[PDB]
Tab-separated table of C-alpha atoms in Angstrom:
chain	number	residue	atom	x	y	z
A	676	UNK	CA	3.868	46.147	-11.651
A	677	UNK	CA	7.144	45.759	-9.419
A	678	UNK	CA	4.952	43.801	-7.046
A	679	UNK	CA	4.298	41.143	-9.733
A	680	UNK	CA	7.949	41.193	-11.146
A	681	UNK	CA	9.178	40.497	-7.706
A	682	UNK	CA	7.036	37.184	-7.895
A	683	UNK	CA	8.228	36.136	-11.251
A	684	UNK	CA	11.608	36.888	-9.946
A	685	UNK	CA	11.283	34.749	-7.453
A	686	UNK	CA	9.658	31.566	-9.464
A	687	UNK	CA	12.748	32.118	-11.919
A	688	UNK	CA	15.222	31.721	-8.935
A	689	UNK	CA	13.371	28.599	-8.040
A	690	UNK	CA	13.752	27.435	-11.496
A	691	UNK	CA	17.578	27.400	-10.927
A	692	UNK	CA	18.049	25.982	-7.160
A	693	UNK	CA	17.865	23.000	-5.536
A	694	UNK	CA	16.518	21.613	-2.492
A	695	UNK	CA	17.662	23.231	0.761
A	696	UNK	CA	19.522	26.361	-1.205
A	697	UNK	CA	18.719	29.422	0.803
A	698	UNK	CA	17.102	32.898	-0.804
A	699	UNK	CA	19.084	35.831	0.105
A	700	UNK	CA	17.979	37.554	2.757
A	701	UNK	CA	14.503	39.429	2.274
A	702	UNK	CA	15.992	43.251	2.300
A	703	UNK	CA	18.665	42.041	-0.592
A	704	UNK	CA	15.891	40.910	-2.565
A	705	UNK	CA	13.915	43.904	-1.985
A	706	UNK	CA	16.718	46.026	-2.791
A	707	UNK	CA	17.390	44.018	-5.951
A	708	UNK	CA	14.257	44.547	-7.403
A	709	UNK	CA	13.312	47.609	-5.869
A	710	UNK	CA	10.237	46.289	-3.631
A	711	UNK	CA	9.287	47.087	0.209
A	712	UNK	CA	10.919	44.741	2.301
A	713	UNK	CA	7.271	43.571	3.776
A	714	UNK	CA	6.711	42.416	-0.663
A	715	UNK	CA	9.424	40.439	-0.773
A	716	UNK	CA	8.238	38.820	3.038
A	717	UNK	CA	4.802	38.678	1.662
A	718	UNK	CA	5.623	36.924	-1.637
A	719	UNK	CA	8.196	34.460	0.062
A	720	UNK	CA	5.218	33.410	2.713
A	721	UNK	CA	2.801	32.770	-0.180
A	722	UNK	CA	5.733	30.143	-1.743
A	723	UNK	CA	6.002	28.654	1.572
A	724	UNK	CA	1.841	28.305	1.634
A	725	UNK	CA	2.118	26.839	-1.429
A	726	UNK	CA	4.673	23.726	-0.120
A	727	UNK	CA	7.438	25.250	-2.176
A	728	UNK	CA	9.611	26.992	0.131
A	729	UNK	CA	9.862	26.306	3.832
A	730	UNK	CA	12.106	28.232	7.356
A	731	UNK	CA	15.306	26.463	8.329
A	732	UNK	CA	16.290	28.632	11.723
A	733	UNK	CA	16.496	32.663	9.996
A	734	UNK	CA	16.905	31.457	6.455
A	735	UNK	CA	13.978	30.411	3.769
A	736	UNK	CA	14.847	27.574	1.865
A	737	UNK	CA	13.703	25.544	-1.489
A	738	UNK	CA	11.562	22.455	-0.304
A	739	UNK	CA	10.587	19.229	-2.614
A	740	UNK	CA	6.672	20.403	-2.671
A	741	UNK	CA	4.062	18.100	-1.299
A	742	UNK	CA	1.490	17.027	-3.721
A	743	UNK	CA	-1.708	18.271	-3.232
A	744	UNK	CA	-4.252	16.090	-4.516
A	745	UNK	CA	-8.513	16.590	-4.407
A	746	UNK	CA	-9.933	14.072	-2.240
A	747	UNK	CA	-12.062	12.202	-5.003
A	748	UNK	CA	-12.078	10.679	-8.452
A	749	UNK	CA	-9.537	12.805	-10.668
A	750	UNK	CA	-6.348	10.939	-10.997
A	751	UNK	CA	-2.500	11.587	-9.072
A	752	UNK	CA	-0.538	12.111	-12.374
A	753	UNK	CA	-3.387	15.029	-13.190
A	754	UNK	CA	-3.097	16.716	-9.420
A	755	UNK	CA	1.006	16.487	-9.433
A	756	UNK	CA	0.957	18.077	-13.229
A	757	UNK	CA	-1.399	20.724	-11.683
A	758	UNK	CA	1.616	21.744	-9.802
A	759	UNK	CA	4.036	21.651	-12.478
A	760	UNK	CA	5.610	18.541	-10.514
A	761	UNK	CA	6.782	14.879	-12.123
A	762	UNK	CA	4.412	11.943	-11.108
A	763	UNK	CA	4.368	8.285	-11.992
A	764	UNK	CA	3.719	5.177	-10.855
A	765	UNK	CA	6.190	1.375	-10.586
A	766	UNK	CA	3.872	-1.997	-10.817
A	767	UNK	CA	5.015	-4.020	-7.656
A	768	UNK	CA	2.893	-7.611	-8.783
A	769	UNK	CA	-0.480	-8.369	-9.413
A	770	UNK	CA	-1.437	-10.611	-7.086
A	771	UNK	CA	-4.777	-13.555	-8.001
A	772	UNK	CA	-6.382	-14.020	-4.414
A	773	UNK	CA	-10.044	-14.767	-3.728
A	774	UNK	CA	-12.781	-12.917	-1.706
A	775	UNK	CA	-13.041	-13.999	2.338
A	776	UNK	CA	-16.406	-13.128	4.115
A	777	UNK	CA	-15.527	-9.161	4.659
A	778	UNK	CA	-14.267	-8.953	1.251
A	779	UNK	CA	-16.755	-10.448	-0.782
A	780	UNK	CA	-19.298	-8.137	1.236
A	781	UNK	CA	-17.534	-4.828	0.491
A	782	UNK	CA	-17.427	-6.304	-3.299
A	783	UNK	CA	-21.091	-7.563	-3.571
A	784	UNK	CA	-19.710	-10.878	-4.645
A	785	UNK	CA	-19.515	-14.060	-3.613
A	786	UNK	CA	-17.298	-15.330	-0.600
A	787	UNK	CA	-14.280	-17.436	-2.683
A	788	UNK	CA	-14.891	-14.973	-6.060
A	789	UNK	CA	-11.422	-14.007	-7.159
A	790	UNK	CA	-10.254	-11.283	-7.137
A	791	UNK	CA	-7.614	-9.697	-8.924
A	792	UNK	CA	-5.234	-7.487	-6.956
A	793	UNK	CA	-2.848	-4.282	-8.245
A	794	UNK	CA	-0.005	-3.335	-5.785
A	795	UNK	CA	1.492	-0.162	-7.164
A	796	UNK	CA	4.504	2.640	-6.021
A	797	UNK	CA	3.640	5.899	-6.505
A	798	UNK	CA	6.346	8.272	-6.934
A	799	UNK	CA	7.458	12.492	-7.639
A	800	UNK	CA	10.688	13.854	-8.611
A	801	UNK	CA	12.557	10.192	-7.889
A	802	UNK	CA	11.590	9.441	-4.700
A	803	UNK	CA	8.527	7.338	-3.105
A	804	UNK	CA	5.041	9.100	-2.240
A	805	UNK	CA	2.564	5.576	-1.489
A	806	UNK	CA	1.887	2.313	-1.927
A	807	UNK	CA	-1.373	1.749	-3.652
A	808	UNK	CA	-3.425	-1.797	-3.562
A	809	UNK	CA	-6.319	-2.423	-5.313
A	810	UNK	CA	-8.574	-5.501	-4.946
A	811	UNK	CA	-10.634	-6.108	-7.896
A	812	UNK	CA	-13.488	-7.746	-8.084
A	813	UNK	CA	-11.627	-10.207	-11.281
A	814	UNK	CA	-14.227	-11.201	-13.124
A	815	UNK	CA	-15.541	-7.558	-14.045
A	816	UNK	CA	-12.262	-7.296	-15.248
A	817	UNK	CA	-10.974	-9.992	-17.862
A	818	UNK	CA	-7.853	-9.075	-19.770
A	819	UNK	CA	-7.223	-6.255	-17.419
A	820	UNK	CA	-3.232	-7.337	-17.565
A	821	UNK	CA	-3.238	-7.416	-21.078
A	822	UNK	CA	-5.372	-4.560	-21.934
A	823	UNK	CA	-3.692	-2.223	-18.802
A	824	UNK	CA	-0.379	-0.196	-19.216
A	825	UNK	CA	0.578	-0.701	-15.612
A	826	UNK	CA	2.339	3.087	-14.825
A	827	UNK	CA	-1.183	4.658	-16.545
A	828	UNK	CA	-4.700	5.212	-14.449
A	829	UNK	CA	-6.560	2.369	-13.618
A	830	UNK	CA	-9.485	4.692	-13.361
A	831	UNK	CA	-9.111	5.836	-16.837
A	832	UNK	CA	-8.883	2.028	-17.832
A	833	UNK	CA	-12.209	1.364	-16.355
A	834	UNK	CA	-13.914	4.277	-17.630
A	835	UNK	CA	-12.649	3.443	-21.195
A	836	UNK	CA	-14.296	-0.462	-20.415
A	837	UNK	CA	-17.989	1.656	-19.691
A	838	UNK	CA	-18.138	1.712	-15.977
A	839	UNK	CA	-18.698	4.974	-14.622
A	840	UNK	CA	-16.933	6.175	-11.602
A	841	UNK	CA	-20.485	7.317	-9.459
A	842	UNK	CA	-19.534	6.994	-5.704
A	843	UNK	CA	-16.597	6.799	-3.613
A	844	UNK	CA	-16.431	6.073	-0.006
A	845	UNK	CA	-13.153	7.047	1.807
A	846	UNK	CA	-11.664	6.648	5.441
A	847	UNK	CA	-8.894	8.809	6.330
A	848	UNK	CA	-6.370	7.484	8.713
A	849	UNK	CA	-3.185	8.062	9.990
A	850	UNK	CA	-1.037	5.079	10.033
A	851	UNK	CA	3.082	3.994	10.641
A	852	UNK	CA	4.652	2.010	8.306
A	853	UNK	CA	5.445	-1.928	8.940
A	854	UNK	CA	8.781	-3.429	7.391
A	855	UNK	CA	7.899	-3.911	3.997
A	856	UNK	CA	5.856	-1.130	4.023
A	857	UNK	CA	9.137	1.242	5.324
A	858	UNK	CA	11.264	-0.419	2.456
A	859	UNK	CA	9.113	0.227	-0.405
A	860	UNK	CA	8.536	3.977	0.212
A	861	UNK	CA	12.206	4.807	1.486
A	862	UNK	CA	10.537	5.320	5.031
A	863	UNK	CA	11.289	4.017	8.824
A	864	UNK	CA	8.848	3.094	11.563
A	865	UNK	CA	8.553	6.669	12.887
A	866	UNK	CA	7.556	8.191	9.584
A	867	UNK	CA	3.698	9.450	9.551
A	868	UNK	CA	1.846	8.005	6.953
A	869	UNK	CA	-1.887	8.702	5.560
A	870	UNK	CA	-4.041	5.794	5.125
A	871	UNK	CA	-7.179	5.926	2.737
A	872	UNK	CA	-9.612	3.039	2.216
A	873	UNK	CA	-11.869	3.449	-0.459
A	874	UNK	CA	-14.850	1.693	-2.217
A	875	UNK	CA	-15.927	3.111	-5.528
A	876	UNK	CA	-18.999	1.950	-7.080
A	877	UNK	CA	-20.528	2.151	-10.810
A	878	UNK	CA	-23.852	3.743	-12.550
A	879	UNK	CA	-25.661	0.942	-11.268
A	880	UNK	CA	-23.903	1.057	-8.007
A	881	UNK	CA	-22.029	-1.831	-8.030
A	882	UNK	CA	-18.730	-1.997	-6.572
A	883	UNK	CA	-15.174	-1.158	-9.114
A	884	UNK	CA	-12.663	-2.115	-6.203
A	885	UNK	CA	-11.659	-1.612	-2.913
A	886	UNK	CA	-8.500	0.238	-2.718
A	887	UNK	CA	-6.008	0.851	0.151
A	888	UNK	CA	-3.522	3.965	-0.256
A	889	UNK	CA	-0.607	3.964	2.322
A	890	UNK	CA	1.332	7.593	1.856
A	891	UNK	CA	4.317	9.386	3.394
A	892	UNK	CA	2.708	12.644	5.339
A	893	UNK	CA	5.716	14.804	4.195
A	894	UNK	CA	5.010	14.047	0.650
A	895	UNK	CA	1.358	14.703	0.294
A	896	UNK	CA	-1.574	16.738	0.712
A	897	UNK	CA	-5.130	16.067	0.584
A	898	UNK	CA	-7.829	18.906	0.341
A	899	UNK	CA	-10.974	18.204	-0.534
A	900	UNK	CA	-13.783	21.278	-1.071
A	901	UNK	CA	-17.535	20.805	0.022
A	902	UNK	CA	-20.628	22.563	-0.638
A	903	UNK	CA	-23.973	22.287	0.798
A	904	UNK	CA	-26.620	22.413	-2.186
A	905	UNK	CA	-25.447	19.068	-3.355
B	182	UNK	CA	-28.491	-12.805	17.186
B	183	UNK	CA	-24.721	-12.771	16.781
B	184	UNK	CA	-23.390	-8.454	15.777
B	185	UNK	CA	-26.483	-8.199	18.639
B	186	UNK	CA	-24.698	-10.295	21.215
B	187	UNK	CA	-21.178	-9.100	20.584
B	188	UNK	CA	-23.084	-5.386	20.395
B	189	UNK	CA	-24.899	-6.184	24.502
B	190	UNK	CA	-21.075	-7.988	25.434
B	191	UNK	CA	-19.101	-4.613	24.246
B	192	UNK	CA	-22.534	-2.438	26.085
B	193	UNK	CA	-20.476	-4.110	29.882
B	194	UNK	CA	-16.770	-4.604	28.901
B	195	UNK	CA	-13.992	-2.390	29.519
B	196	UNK	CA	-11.496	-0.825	27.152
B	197	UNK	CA	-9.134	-3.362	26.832
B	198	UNK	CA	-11.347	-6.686	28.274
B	199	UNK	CA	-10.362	-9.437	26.593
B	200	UNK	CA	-13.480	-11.644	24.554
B	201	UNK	CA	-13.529	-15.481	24.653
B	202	UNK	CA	-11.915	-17.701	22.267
B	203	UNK	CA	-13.727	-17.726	18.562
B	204	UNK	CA	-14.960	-21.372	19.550
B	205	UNK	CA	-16.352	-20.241	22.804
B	206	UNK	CA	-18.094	-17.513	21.387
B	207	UNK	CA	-19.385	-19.660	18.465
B	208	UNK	CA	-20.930	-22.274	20.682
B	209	UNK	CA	-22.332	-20.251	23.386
B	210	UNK	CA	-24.807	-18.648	20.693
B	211	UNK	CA	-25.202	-22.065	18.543
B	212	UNK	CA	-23.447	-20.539	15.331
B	213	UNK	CA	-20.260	-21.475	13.249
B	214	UNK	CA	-16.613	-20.593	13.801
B	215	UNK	CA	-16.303	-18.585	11.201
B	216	UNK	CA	-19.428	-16.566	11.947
B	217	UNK	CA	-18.249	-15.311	14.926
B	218	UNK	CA	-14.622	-14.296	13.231
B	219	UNK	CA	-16.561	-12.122	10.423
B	220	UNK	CA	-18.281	-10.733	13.063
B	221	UNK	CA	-15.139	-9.803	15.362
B	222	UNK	CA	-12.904	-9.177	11.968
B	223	UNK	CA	-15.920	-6.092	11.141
B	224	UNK	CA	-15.993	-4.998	14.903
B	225	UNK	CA	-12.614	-4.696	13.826
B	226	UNK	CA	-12.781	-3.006	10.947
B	227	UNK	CA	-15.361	-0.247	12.646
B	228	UNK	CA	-12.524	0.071	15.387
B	229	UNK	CA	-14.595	-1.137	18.181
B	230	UNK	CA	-12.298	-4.073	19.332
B	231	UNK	CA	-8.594	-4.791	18.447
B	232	UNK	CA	-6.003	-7.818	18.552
B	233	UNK	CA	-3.949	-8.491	21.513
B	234	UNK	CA	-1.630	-11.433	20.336
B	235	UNK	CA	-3.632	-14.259	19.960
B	236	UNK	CA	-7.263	-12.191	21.585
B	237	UNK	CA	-8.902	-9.802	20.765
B	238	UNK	CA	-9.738	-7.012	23.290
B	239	UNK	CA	-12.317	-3.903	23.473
B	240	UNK	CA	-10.762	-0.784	21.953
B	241	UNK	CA	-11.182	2.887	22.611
B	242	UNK	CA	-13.264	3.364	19.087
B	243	UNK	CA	-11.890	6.869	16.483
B	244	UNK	CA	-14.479	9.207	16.531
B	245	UNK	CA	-15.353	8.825	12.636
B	246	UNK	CA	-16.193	12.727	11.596
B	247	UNK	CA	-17.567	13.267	8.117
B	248	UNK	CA	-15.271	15.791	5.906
B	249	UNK	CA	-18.001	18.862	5.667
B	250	UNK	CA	-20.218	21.163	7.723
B	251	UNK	CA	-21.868	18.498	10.209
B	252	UNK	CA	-20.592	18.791	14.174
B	253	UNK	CA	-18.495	16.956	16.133
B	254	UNK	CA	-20.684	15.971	18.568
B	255	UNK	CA	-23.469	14.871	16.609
B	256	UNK	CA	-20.703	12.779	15.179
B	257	UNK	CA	-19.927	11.188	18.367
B	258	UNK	CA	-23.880	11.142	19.328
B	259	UNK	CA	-23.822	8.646	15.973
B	260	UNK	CA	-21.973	6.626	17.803
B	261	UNK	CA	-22.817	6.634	21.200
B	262	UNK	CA	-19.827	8.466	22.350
B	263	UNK	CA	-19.847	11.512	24.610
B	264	UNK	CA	-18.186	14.556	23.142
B	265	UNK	CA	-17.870	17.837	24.267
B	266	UNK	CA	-15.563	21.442	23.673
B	267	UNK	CA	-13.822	23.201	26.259
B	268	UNK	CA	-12.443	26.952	26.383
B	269	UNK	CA	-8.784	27.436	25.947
B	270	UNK	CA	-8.970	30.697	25.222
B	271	UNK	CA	-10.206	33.773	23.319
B	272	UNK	CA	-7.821	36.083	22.069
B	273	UNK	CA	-8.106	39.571	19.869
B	274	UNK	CA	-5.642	39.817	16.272
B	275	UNK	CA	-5.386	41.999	13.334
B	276	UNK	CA	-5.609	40.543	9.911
B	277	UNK	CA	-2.315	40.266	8.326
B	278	UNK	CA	-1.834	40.269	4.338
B	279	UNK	CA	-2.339	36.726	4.364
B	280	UNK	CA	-4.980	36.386	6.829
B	281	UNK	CA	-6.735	39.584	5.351
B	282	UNK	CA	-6.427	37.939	2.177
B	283	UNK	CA	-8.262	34.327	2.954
B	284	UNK	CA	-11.372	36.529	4.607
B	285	UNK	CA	-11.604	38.501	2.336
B	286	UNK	CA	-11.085	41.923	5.053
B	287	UNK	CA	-8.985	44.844	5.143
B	288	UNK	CA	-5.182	44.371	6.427
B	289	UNK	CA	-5.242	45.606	9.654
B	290	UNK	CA	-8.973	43.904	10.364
B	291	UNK	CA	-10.217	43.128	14.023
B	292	UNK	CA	-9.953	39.167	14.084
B	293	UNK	CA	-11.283	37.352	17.054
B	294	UNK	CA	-9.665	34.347	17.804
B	295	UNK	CA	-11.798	31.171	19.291
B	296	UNK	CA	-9.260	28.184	20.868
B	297	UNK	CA	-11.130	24.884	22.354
B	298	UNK	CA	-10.217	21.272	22.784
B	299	UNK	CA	-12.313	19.038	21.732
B	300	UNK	CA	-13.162	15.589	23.902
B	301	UNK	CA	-14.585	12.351	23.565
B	302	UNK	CA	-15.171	9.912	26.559
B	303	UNK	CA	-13.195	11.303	29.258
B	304	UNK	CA	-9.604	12.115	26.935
B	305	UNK	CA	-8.571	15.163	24.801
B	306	UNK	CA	-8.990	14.505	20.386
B	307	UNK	CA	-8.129	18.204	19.297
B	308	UNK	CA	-7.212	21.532	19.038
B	309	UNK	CA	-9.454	23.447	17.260
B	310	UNK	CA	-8.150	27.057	16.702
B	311	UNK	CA	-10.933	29.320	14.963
B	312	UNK	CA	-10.231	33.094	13.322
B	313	UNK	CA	-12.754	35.187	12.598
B	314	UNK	CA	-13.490	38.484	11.453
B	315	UNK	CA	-14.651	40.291	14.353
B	316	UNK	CA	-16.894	43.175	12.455
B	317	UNK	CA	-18.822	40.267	11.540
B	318	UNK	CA	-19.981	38.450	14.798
B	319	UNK	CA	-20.532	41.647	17.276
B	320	UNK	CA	-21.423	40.356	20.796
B	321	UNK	CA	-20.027	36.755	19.948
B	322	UNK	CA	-17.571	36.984	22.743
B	323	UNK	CA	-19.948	38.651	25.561
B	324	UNK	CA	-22.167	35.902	24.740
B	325	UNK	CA	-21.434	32.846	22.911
B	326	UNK	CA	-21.997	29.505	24.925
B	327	UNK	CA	-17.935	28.123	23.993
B	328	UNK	CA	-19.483	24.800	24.672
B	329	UNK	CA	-21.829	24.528	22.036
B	330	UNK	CA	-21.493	24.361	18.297
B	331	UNK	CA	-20.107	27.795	17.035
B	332	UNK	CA	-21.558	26.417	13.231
B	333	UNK	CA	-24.963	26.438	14.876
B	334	UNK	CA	-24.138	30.275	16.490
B	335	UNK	CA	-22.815	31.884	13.266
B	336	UNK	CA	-26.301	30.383	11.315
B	337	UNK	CA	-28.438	31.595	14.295
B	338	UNK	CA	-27.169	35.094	13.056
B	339	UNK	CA	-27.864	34.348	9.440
B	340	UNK	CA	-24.605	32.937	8.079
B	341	UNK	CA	-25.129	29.993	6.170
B	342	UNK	CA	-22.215	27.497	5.579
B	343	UNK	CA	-22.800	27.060	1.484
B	344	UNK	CA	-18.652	26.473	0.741
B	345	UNK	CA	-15.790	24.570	2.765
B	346	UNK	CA	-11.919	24.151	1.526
B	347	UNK	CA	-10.061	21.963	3.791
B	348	UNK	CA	-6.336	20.964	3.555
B	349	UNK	CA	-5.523	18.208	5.314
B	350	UNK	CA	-1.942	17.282	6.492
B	351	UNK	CA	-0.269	14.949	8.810
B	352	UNK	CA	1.763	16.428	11.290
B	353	UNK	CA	3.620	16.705	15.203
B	354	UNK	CA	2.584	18.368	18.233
B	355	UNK	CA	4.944	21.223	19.323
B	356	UNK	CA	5.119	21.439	23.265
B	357	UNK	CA	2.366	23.197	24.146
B	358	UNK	CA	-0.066	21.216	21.860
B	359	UNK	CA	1.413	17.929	23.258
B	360	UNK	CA	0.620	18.839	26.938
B	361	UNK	CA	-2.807	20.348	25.732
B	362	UNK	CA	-3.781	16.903	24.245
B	363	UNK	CA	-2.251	14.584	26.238
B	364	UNK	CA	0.189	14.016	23.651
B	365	UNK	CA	3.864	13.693	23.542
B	366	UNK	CA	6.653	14.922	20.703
B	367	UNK	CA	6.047	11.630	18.156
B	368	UNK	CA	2.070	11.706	18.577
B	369	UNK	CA	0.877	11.547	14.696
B	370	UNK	CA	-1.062	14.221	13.864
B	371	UNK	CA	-4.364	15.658	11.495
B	372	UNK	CA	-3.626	19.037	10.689
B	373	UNK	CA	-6.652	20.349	8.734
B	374	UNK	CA	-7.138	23.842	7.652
B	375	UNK	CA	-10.232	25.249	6.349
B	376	UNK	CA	-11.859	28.249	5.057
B	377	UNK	CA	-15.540	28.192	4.912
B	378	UNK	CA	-17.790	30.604	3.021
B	379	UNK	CA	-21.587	31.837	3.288
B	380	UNK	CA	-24.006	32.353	0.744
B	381	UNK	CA	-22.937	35.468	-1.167
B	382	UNK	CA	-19.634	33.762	-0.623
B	383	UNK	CA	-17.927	35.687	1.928
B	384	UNK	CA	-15.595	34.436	4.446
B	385	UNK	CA	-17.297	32.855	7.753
B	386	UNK	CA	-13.648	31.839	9.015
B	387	UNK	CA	-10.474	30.241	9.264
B	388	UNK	CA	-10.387	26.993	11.372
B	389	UNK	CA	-7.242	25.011	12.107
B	390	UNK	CA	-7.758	21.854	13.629
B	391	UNK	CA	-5.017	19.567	15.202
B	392	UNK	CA	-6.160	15.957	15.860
B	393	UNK	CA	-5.062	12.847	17.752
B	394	UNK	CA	-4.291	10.506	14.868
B	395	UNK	CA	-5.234	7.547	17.429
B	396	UNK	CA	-8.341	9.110	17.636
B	397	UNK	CA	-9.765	9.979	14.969
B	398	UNK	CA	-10.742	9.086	11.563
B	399	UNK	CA	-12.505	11.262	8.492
B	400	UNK	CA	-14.890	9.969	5.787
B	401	UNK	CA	-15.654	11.780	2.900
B	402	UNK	CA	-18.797	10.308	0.321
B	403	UNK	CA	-18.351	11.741	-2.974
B	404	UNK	CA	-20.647	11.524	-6.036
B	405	UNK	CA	-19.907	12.300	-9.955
B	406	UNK	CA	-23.003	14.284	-10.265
């Protein structure tokens, strides 16, 4: 059992350090709990797998965890909770614009349609993680300011109006920040960012929105699991 | 006639030609203004051309890979790009606990290590760093084609891919990766990670794979059922 104290150990000294506080070194915490040096190694390289520890020169320190959210269509509160970390989301504006050529393609509407637009900041333990915007096709949508609690999911607000999340269709990029961009998400023009574009379509495949997703790389994880029957 | 012409124009141009002004385009094939900008904005949007202050020029296109077991090349092929995988090195490991952990082997297990960079149209995309327990693959070394498609090897021994986990992260190059990809120390960065599993489950490997942001892009089609 002194391999799985060790561990528990361990999460309770988490519990009670901040960011950048360094463990003792791995033979004092062997010692302390009377564990091979190579359990204590062993345990501290698992924390450091899992985002919540990383190396600064000899030393292992506590890191701000990335979130690590499925590639798909459960929601970012429900990954970051997952992790025992504290999610939410700031409305930036809606935004009425209507559909150009491209647009009203990726939509399956008309060119000129309007479209309603959601520009959100995603955030974890204060600080920013992304800049979400969602085009809406606006007339699936009417009362979607009055009926929507802006810092909930949007895809739980258009499941609970009958439209069934069925496909999604992402690109993965990686991207740089412009000015705005850099302001809103406490970034500079060097940071690496992830940028997703996604359509998501309904039961009778017609599109729910077209949604861009502009993240800080040292805030977030994707992983996504495949398997070949389906 | 219009994505067609634009499609036979891009066939001759260089990376980097510029095209003619909208209006030029638009009445050289008897069609509207604004039909030749949707047609340019998607060319665009597939990453085939790109805007040069007021132009817009021929790009080098991201090879657009599908998250999953599919190849590289064929990936590529889909897009008439030339792709190919060159030998960087093989090297021979022991598991460690963590290693010997994700394969599911003993600590202390033979792991054979499989490094390539991968290429598309003349330039380096990635480094593609493969572990694998060796008990598993006897022979693979002695005679495995490191050009080819190592998915299509381990099935042609009866290993089907059934299960993939892939983590994917941005990331930097350190120095050797930088002069491996033609890189430098700001290059952004795909770092995926992935353990894939056969059909009673068992580990096939562990594949890290470090990609040139600028060239590359994953997709990823996901259903509810």
């Amino acid at each position: 059992l002194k391999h799985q104290v060790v561990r528990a150990e361990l999460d309770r000294m988490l519990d009670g350090m901040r960011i950048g506080d360094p463990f003792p070194a791995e033979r004092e915490i062997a010692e302390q709990f009377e564990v091979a040096r190579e359990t204590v190694r062993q345990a501290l390289r698992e924390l450091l797998i899992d985002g919540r520890v990383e190396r600064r020169g000899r030393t292992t320190v506590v890191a701000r965890p990335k979130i690590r959210q499925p590639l798909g269509m459960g929601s970012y509160t429900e990954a970051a909770k997952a992790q025992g970390l504290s999610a939410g989301r700031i409305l930036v504006a809606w935004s009425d614009l209507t559909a150009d050529e491209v647009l009203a393609g990726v939509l399956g509407v008309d060119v000129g349609a309007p479209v309603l637009q959601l520009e959100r900041v995603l955030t974890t333990d204060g600080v920013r993680v992304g800049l979400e915007t969602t085009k809406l096709p606006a007339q699936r949508y009417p009362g979607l300011r009055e009926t929507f609690d802006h810092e909930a999911s949007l895809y739980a607000e258009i499941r609970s109006r009958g439209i069934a999340f069925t496909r999604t269709v992402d690109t993965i990029d990686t991207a740089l920040p412009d000015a705005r961009e850099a302001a809103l998400l406490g970034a500079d023009a060097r940071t690496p960012m992830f940028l997703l574009n996604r359509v998501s379509y309904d039961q009778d495949d017609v599109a729910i929105e077209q949604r861009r997703s502009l993240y800080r790389g040292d805030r977030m994880t994707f992983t996504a699991v495949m398997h070949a029957k389906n």
